[PDB]
Amino acid sequence: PSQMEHAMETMMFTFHKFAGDKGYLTKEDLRVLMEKEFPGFLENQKDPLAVDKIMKDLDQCRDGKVGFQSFFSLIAGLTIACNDYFVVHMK
Amino acid sequence: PSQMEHAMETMMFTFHKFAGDKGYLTKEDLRVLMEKEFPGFLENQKDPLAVDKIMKDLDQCRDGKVGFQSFFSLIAGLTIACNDYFVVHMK
């Protein structure tokens, strides 16, 4: 498998891991996910409303459910922010 | 670091590796990036124009260049397809 394929699999298996048989994640799931997979970020975000605000944007329909694609939209936004930051300050 | 951070780095460094200092991919870089990452995918499409059609949806501006965010829409597009297949047939 290539590195790209291992990476895509890790992101697929991640979401499933926190989503359960129910196939989606609640806000209770986003937080944990975010805690165990991005440790230096919510805690370093100073605010206590961290997760709620993430989810605001993830949940159009306010049904309290985050599915795969919206999950991907989270990762996309974090990855593109890091890339922006990398190209300017580090590349 | 977490698995997720490792996955994101690997995608962002994968971009930078085929794009070089110029910071963007061209059609040729896109095809080499698919040949080396995802070599079971292209060739199993039976279409020798596959790359060209991918490039076509990715070049909003028709300027022949694929930035980080279009490359990312391409990876989301494959990841989300991989997950719809996996939920239905493999879990």
């Binding site: 230096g40 970020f41 930051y85 | 951070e5």
Partner: peptide, 11 residues
Amino acid sequence: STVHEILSKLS
């Protein structure tokens, strides 16, 4: 190791 540190600069 590099995404971890940049996330920290976004945090």
